[PDB]
RNA sequence: AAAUUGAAGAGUUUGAUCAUGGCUCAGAUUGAACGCUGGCGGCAGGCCUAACACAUGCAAGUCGAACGGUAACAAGAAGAAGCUUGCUUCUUUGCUGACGAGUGGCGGACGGGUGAGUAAUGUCUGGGAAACUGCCUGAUGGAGGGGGAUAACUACUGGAAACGGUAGCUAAUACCGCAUAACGUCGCAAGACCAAAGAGGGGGACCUUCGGGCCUCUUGCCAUCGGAUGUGCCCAGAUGGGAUUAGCUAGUAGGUGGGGUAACGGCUCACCUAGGCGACGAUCCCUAGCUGGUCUGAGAGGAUGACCAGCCACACUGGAACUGAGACACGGUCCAGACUCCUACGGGAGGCAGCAGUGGGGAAUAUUGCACAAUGGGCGCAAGCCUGAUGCAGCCAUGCCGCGUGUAUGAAGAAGGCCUUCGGGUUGUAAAGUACUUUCAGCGGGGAGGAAGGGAGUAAAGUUAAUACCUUUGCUCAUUGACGUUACCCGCAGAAGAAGCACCGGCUAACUCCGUGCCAGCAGCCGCGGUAAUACGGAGGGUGCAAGCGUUAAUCGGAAUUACUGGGCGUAAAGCGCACGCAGGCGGUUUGUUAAGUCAGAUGUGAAAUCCCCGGGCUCAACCUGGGAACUGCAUCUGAUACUGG
């Protein structure tokens, strides 16, 4: 189905996972109708890690759209702390 | 034929296909008993044979094997015939 | 085809195996291509310390 | 990465003085700066258009301490950025590392510079760098480490930078040994003997 | 408000359709030539009364029998 | 605060000049190979050739909360064995954790690999209707009651094996009837038709044949209308060369009627009209996956499709069909052809252009490595299982970038070498020696981070007859890493463990001696070798690059030498021998009409990735990343007629 997960599109040993609403056939790092934000598990403090767009994630999500685990877990981070 | 799960769904696909053809034989002679009785002349006949016929074609529709497009294509065009025949 | 053997002194005879490489002679008539040195058998060049890279010759003790 | 000969010959050869000694005594006095080394340094030929620029890209190559792949990078740079090519070569080379500290005074030469800098003795902002590309930004302060700031070599190098004309876009400080990078040199501040019309003509060639 | 075109029609020797030839204006890639294009199409007219040498006007459709997926709208200038 | 920083010529025809004109060179680039050399690290790449065959190991399994059942698994739990008062046993899965085999759903159509075929049925751009869509989600209702088989097993039993047959068996969310319904189907209406499946967590009162009813919860199953995604189809513009490839097409153009797919469709048959395509290149031949992109170039253009991304096509070759929502399906099915391998000669098994690796070809391609720890995918209520995707490990200078291989010195301008006008110069501050540093490598230690969740417990709310049971919210504790000798830092001691390659007549940056003597030889062009040619080999010296240096292979600039930007035809190559004329190209002058070409604005789009501009993070760059710009194109809508056209 239709999900919205994360494509690492980093380095080697430099992880950065763009939040894409891809179907759930397609690749991980492939297809995708579009991106929602982004996440860095390697920036430190002083940069903007997490970028999600709530209203459009919510959109989706709205439309059967399925949140990955991790996923989750960034938007209720997100959400605590702002 | 090297992976147990594809030799136990092409096991299951023989005892599907054995009851598909099955189903989709007497459909099909349903359906050939409209025609026989459409081009036999009288139009009672006709619209006996589509009576009957009709309960089994939207059952397999609703059931699988066949669409309910190709019901009511065949339906339509049955009926199309049996009215417009004298 | 013909190729040149560049350098002094060689060991080609029948039935070698060489490596072919692109370059033509202009005062040679037919002659399109060369063979380089340091290959499976034509050996580099004796007594040659200059320009080694072009004729297959090891470097000095 | 380096050039690891004589650092006269150079010097001798491009015709004037690349500022590759201490300074402690003369250039004359210490070489034979007038003709090029070998044996037919005192044959002078004609140079061509090529020929020149081809002096003028190794004597700027040779002051600064860079390669041909490295200067090649910095040409680029510059013409990228907009402004003046020459004037955004020279300021690209003279933001390294090493060059703010041989203008800093804290080592005699730039091959010294870079060492330190290499060493782990120079700390900027806290924080050790061992590149002697490093690029320093304006209002960057550049200081040394402390087991570095207590030897003879920095002290040395100190007291014998007084002798040359101190750089104006620096405002290092000799009591903690450390400086704060101030606005960019420009060509005025910098010699105006570099000829950088040649040098954006070589690389446009 | 609808896309639509409007060509030539050279010939309507078949039942129920005509052979039209749009004509459009391009620039030559290359050379910068302006240039006649041709573009033409088999339109499909139900009651067949459009003859050879006016100007005819079609719409996009779906396609009816292998190739011709337009459909007439209006004639205009029928004169010969 | 910007996507603006853009253009170099030289040698060579001639006694000498001008111009034309051909060749070569300086430059940049690549999936690279060869010769020499070679230290570390970071980021990428690593069968272009044989779509040539494969030994071997692993790549698609899954759930008992679907079911009968349980021969291996733990307690022999429980009863109880001839009990040793704990050695064990015919039992026991309508007691349990859990699943060897099996039925049954999902996934196998996703993930992974290769460009053979394909010059258009494919691809890109912009629209269109005649459709399908499991898992996902919103809304409306049902979820009543029966039937007979079967896998397992059992007695056999055919056959060397692969497999298969007889009879009795039976439980399923297995299979099939019956009852009901439209906002569904068919029908102008009237009217006819359409299915379902149940499981698990508990628990008061009442029960109960003590199986389990009764109540909530969790979840699953049908019918219909919606959404998202995917798929299928059509139309318009571009998509290599050849005319020494001028006709092709009889299901072919269209129409009538019927049958068929999810629908439109000669998709196909049965009749009718002979049309359809083509000098704006039909048909035929060769080659070729397309695109975003990549390299060269100031741009215009030229070549090209490495990695990645989207699409297409193919799974030893050809043909075909079934299940399945979704295939004519890489590790699903049948047959034909070849190969390989068993056979007891009746007979049977296989397709690595999957991940590693083998044989063969080639100038040239890497380990038969670890982990599901993170991201997904598949299954499962969840724990949980698999993933040769992926996250990583190893080798290769194959590509880019960074660092180092010291340093201040140090004159008797040490010694030696080189030539030497033998008085001196070169190497050369070079070397020796001295002071200084210990990057990087080795040793001994500390050592973040990629890890988010999950289970065991405690509370409040949401339910609910009910604090039961479940979800949500939090709460502290016990927990999970292949990389990993982690990045990074600290102390050891010593300058050690680390520089080579090409060129030196002009193009082009750099000259002097010795050895042959048109011989050896160099060569990209001019051209050199007939006692010294700064041109061959050796030496000194210098020049250039640098862990790289040269050659080779390929593209472009220069080449304005295919010229749209940006050329010529009297003599360097170029006016048909001349005239008429079709298609085609252009077109005197005024006004009116329209707005096709043109212009301005707006919308959709031009995927992401990539270039450029502004910033950030690895000590810094390479690398990654956020926003902007750009994608110069197409369609639509609104206004202008000066110009071209109607
Ligand atoms: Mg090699
Ligand atoms: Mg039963
Ligand atoms: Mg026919
Ligand atoms: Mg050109
Ligand atoms: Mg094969
Ligand atoms: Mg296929
Ligand atoms: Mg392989
Ligand atoms: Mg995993
Ligand atoms: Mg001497
Ligand atoms: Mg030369
Ligand atoms: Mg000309
Ligand atoms: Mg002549
Ligand atoms: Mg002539
Ligand atoms: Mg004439
Ligand atoms: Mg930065
Ligand atoms: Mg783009
Ligand atoms: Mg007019």
């Given amino acids: 189905m239709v999900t919205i997960r994360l494509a690492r599109h980093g380095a080697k040993k430099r992880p950065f996972y763009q939040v894409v609403v891809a179907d759930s056939r397609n690749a991980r790092n492939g297809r995708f109708i579009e991106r929602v934000g982004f996440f860095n598990p390697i920036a430190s403090e002083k940069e903007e890690g997490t970028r999600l767009d709530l209203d459009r994630i919510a959109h989706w999500v709205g439309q059967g759209a399925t949140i990955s685990d991790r996923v989750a877990a960034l938007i209720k981070e997100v959400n605590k702390a702002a | 034929a090297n992976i147990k799960s594809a030799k136990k769904r092409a096991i299951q696909s023989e005892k599907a296909r054995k009851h598909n053809a099955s189903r989709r034989s007497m459909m099909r002679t349903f359906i050939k008993k409209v025609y026989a009785a459409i081009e036999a002349g009288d139009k009672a006949a006709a619209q006996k044979a589509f009576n009957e016929m009709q309960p089994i074609v ?27 025949l004298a | 085809v013909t190729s040149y053997i560049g350098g002094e002194g060689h060991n080609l005879q029948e039935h070698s195996v060489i490596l072919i490489r692109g370059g033509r002679v202009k005062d040679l008539p037919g002659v399109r291509y060369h063979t380089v040195r340091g290959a499976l058998d034509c050996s580099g060049v004796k007594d040659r310390k200059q320009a080694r890279s072009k004729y297959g010759v090891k470097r000095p003790k | 990465a380096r050039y690891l000969g004589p650092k006269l010959k150079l010097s001798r050869r491009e015709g004037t ?21 070998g044996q037919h340094g005192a044959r002078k030929p004609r140079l061509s258009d090529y020929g020149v620029q081809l002096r003028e890209k190794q004597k700027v190559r040779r002051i600064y301490g860079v390669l041909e792949r490295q200067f090649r990078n910095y040409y680029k740079e510059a013409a990228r950025l907009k402004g003046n ?4 070569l020279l300021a690209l080379l003279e933001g390294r590392l090493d060059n703010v500290v041989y203008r800093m005074g804290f080592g005699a030469t730039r091959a010294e510079a870079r060492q330190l800098v290499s060493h782990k003795a120079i700390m900027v902002n806290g924080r050790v760098v061992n590149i002697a590309s490093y690029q320093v930004s304006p209002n960057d302060v550049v200081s040394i480490r402390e087991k570095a700031k207590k030897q003879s070599r920095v002290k040395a190098a100190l007291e014998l930078a007084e002798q040359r004309e101190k750089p104006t876009w620096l405002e290092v400080d000799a009591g903690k040994m450390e400086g704060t990078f101030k606005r960019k040199p420009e060509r005025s501040d910098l010699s105006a003997d570099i000829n950088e019309h040649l040098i954006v003509e070589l690389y446009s060639k | 408000k609808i896309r639509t075109l409007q060509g030539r029609v050279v010939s309507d020797k078949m039942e129920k359709s005509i052979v039209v030839a749009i004509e459009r204006f391009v ?11 041709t573009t033409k199409l088999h339109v499909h007219d139900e009651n067949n009364e459009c003859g050879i040498g006016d100007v005819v006007e079609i719409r996009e459709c779906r396609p009816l029998s292998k190739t011709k997926s337009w459909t007439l709208v209006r004639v205009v200038e029928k004169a010969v």
């Fill in chain 4, 85 to 88: 090519t020459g004037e955004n």
């Fill in chain 5, 27 to 37: 620039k030559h890639p290359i050379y910068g030539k302006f240039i006649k294009r």
């Fill in chain 2, 58 to 84: 939207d059952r397999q529709a609703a059931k699988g094997l066949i669409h309910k497009n190709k019901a009511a294509r065949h339906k339509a065009n049955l009926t199309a015939q049996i009215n417009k």
């Fill in chain 4, 17 to 37: 003085d690349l500022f590759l000694k201490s300074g402690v005594r003369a250039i004359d006095t210490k070489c034979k700066i007038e003709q090029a080394p």
